């Protein structure tokens, strides 16, 4: 553990500290772009609803688990668990889940699982919509269910931190359904970016504390090494001065 390794660790920590700020800038730009896209989609969806309304003139619970599994994810998972326990009647409602965790939560409550998917299918919003919209149409056409809603194990800065959820059904229909699903996905992505900003802000402090600990340890080792080296050198010196010390002691003890 020499000064070279300490310097290399220091420069690596500095590089990561700067890259965190750069990533923060990039994530802010991405968030602004997604906000603009969501606003445009909301305007188009409102126009589409108006035009459809002029043209015309048991619940399905879809559950999605978080992307990762950290302490925040576990807390959100257990809150989603109590929300399920307080907002589902198994004898009358049907629950479709994607992800191992929400699938287990549905299993433990003996709910009726329509099907089980892989979580990464949610990443492709187009395929996700093209699949579950047709499934929901086939369902509500048979009157097996007439209420459809979406819940995610994820926090929203608008609801004072509560979970994101939306009751899509009940309110050319398929285009409106796709637009609503796209809006839900965009809201989720916006919330995720807003959380990511604070996560980066935390990582910066973690790096700083790591640097402080490393510097303390390095200095603590260096001082001991230097002291031991100096003591060895002077012991090697003072071995050769024994005779003069003994002579001086004897002369002092002889008397006068």
């Amino acid at each position: 553990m020499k000064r070279k390794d300490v310097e290399e660790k220091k420069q690596n920590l500095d590089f990561y500290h700067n890259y965190i700020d750069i990533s923060k800038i990039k994530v802010l730009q991405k968030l602004n772009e997604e906000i603009a896209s969501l606003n445009m989609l909301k305007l188009q969806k409102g126009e589409s609803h108006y035009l459809l309304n002029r043209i015309i003139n048991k619940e399905l619970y879809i559950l999605i688990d978080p992307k990762k599994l950290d302490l925040f994810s576990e807390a959100l998972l257990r809150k989603l668990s109590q929300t399920v326990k307080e907002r589902i009647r198994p004898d009358k409602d049907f629950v479709i889940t994607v992800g191992t965790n929400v699938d287990n939560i549905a299993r433990q409550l003996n709910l009726n699982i329509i099907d089980h998917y892989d979580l990464d299918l949610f990443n492709q919003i187009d395929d996700f919509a093209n699949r579950i919209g047709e499934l929901v149409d086939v369902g509500l056409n048979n009157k097996i269910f007439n209420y459809v809603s979406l819940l995610i194990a994820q926090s929203s800065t608008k609801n004072n931190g509560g979970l994101v959820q939306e009751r899509i059904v009940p309110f050319f229909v398929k285009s409106v359904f796709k637009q609503e699903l796209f809006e839900f996905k965009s809201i989720s992505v916006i919330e995720e970016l807003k959380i990511e900003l604070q996560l980066l802000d935390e990582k910066k402090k973690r790096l700083e504390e790591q640097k402080k600990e490393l510097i303390l340890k390095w200095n603590r080792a260096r001082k001991e090494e230097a002291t031991l080296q100096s003591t060895l050198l002077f012991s090697a010196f003072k071995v050769k001065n024994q005779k003069s010390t003994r002579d001086e002691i004897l002369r002092l003890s002889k008397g006068k």
């Binding site: 688990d65 992307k67 990762k68 992800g99 191992t100 979580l119 990464d120």
Partner: protein, 132 residues
């Protein structure tokens, strides 16, 4: 320390073991105790002794402050005799559990891109949590 500090201990701890019937027939079991500083197990005396002894029981301050008692870190502990120091039923009951605990710790630390866990890894996690 002086340079003798290894021998000073080795010639001591070598005075124990299991002996044959023609030389006393008994057995001396030794349990020496050593203190580490800030969890640094790679100190001079601590390592000199890990080299003279036949194993180690490492007590963790992190586990002690968390309420675990005894605060033994099984991941950092080892016995070099293994099942040879156990009876047959005890050897069969715990034939391969330490490797499972090591794998469980490794899997808990490891970070992967896939959001799903393979079933063998899930079984290992269950067994490790139950073992704890």
């Amino acid at each position: 320390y002086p340079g003798d500090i290894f021998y000073v201990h080795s010639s001591l701890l070598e005075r124990g073991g299991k002996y044959g019937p023609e030389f006393g027939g008994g057995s001396i079991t030794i349990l020496p105790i050593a203190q580490t500083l800030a969890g640094d197990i790679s100190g001079y005396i601590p390592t000199n002794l890990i080299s003279i002894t036949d194993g180690q029981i490492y007590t963790s301050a992190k586990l002690f402050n968390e309420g675990t008692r005894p605060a033994i870190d099984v991941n950092l502990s080892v016995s070099r005799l293994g099942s040879a120091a156990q009876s047959k039923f005890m050897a069969f009951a715990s034939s391969g559990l330490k490797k499972i605990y090591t794998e469980y710790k490794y899997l808990k630390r490891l970070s992967s891109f896939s959001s799903k866990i393979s079933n063998r890894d899930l079984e290992t996690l269950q067994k490790g949590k139950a073992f704890e």
